[PDB]
């Protein structure tokens, strides 16, 4: 199928320079009428188109921008590159890139999207630690459990549950910086309550901008006490 | 350019119509649908052709400098932010988005209170996390009460985006508290206040009840 995928550094440091690849297949952009593109988005905020290369390497900025703008591409290696100079706080965004097929349509297929912060506070994977089901007897219908992923920077981290067995019922909440400059977020899952105790629930947490990678066990706790 | 409305909760069936002026003449208009931190889907381009697999009940429509997207009879998953793109003539230039909701009937939160983990604890720190679940309208009022005192300050909420299936909200309110404080004190309650509560439901725990 056509693919496209974009990659780079998750954070950059303001008035460095970023350089951004899109990697696609499924198609080649020495076919006639092919073009690759590139948009962003600022968190919360609208899509800003940012440039464009054609098949017979014909560049495109947006204006506003081309200044700092320069696109490329290398057919050989089926990848565009966009390199953006003098990074800004305000250049925070995700960024996609695009296939479009001049004199017929904008933008067909889009790449995931890769996620660049420009700040100059460093790298930090996370800690992350079990929400104990409050359950743990049987004949209670449903639990909830989940893990707190905090204290990790930049975004984005993802989370699954059962190495993607369990996804019915997630809610893996949108990160929130803290006070102390650093992002923390809890994702949550209801089960059946008689799977406490028996079913084995384990959060696998990636933060690719650090390469870190955590599971944790959630589990009803043993209570301290006189047994 | 211009879109319009920027915000906009409808109810199933509902036609919604979404409009782009642009102040300059446009030869055609393009638009997409983007779920939350998804990627955009294109549904229209040359202004009214429906892309590929896209439900025939999105048309485009329009010219000069006034385009339009509608939605004849909107659903649960038709939640998302809507965009104009003018690739006809520079500069190319997207639209601001219109973000549209689905309303649903009122659907009460089921609530849920975790304690700090001893684990955490070790770390210095203690967050308590309280989680409503699966609710509608998203206004919820979340208060934390440490030994019946009323918190301020000192946690962070977080709301899911609208569910493409269910129409509802969850949302977190976590609190943050030192070791330290968080052993100054025995009861740890979250308060909650919805429309679809008759009266206020409250989770909590003691300190070392485990």
């Known amino acids: 199928q056509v693919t496209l995928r974009e990659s780079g550094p998750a954070l950059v440091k303001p008035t460095q320079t970023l350089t951004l690849t899109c990697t696609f297949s499924g198609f080649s952009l020495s076919t006639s009428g092919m073009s690759v593109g590139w948009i962003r988005q600022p968190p919360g905020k609208a899509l800003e188109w940012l440039a464009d290369?054609?098949?017979?390497?014909?560049?495109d900025y947006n204006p506003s921008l081309k200044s700092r703008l320069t696109i490329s591409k290398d057919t050989s290696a089926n990848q565009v590159v966009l390199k953006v100079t003098n990074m800004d706080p305000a250049d925070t965004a995700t960024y996609y890139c695009?296939?479009?097929?001049?004199?017929?349509?904008?933008?067909?297929?889009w790449g995931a999207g890769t996620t660049v912060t420009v700040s100059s506070a460093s790298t930090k994977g996370p800690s992350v630690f079990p929400l104990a089901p409050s359950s743990a007897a049987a004949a209670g219908g449903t639990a909830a459990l989940g893990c707190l992923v905090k204290d990790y920077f930049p975004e984005p981290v993802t989370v699954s549950w059962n190495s993607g067995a369990l996804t019915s019922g997630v809610h893996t909440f949108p990160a929130v910086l803290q006070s102390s400059g650093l992002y923390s977020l809890s994702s949550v899952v209801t089960v059946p309550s008689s799977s406490l105790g028996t079913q084995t629930y384990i959060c696998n947490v990636n933060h690719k901008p650090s390469n870190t990678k955590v599971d944790k066990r959630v589990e009803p706790k043993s209570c301290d006490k006189t047994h | 350019m211009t879109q319009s409305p920027s915000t906009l909760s409808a109810s199933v069936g509902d036609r919604v119509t979404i409009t782009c002026k642009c102040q300059?003449?446009?030869?055609?208009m393009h638009w997409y649908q983007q779920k939350p931190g998804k990627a955009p889907k294109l549904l229209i381009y040359d202004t009214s052709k429906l892309a590929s697999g896209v439900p025939s009940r999105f048309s485009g429509s329009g010219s000069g400098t006034a385009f339009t997207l509608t939605i004849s009879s909107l659903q649960p998953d038709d939640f998302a932010t809507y965009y104009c793109?003018?690739?006809?003539?520079?500069?190319?230039?997207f639209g601001g988005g219109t973000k549209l909701e689905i309303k649903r009937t009122v659907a009460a939160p089921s609530v849920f209170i975790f304690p700090p983990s001893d684990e955490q604890l070790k770390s210095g720190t203690a967050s308590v996390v309280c989680l409503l679940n699966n609710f509608y309208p998203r206004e919820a009022k979340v208060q934390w009460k440490v030994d019946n005192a009323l918190q301020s300050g000192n946690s962070q909420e977080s709301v899911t985006e609208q569910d493409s299936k269910d129409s509802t909200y969850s949302l977190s309110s976590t609190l943050t508290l030192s070791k330290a404080d968080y052993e100054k004190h025995k009861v740890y309650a979250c308060e909650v206040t919805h429309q679809g509560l008759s009266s206020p439901v409250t989770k909590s725990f003691n300190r070392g009840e485990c």
């Open positions: 300059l003449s446009v030869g055609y």
């Open positions: 695009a296939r479009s097929m001049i004199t017929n349509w904008y933008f067909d297929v």
């Open positions: 793109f003018q690739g006809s003539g520079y500069p190319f230039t």
């Open positions: 290369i054609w098949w017979d390497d014909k560049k």
